Design an enzyme around this catalytic site. Structure first.
Site, PDB file in Angstrom:
ATOM      1  CD  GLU A  11      35.893  42.534  50.257  1.00 16.01           C
ATOM      2  OE1 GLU A  11      34.794  43.086  49.648  1.00 16.01           O
ATOM      3  OE2 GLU A  11      36.176  41.532  49.838  1.00 16.01           O
ATOM      4  CG  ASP A  20      28.520  40.843  45.927  1.00 16.94           C
ATOM      5  OD1 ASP A  20      28.013  40.100  44.983  1.00 16.94           O
ATOM      6  OD2 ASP A  20      29.102  39.551  46.779  1.00 16.94           O
TER       7      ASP A  20
END
Ligand SMILES: [Ar]
Ligand SMILES: [Ar]
Ligand SMILES: [Cl-]
Ligand SMILES: [Cl-]
Length: 162
Positions: A11, A20
């Site tokens: 991440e 994202d």
């Protein structure tokens, strides 16, 4: 290696609001803020999450605090899901961490949808599982990460991350 380190690699860490891979406002270590296309809405959600007027920016410690809560919530979500829990309990430590990564990424719901893969992992048919897991939008959209998680379920070792 462990779940935290594993997810920290997949991440990343960002201290300012970002989009994202799906274009959703996120901050920190993959902490999704909202599916809304409004930056204001994301800032509102961030303030509420942190408990202070952040202005779209947080510290490392705050990011890490959100991250701990999110890992914790993911595990608990697995344990509370009738479909997931039994799979989870049948796995060894390494593989469990692969299951958590997936739920962290896509939600309980999403994961609970891989009925067939789920069943093959429960039966310890690793290679077959690996092939079925790859037949998914998840894999086609984030192939590098998916391959790492998939290898993890396949081998039960951390080689994909070393
Ligand atoms: Ar699972
Ligand atoms: Ar799965
Ligand atoms: Cl929160
Ligand atoms: Cl990826």
């Amino acid at each position: 290696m462990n779940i935290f380190e594993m997810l920290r690699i997949d991440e990343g860490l960002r201290l300012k609001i970002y989009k994202d891979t799906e274009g959703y406002y996120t901050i920190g270590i993959g902490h999704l803020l909202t599916k809304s296309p409004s930056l204001n809405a994301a800032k509102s959600e961030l303030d509420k999450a942190i408990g202070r007027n952040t202005n779209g920016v947080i510290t490392k410690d705050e990011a890490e605090k959100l991250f701990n809560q999110d890992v914790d919530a993911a595990v608990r979500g697995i344990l509370r899901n009738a479909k997931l829990k039994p799979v989870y309990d049948s796995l060894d430590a390494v593989r469990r961490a692969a299951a958590i990564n997936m739920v962290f990424q896509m939600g309980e719901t999403g994961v609970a949808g891989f009925t067939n893969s789920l069943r093959m992992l429960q039966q310890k048919r690793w290679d077959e599982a690996a092939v079925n897991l790859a037949k998914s939008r998840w894999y086609n959209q984030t192939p590098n990460r998916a391959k790492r998680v998939i290898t993890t379920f396949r081998t039960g070792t951390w080689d994909a991350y070393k």
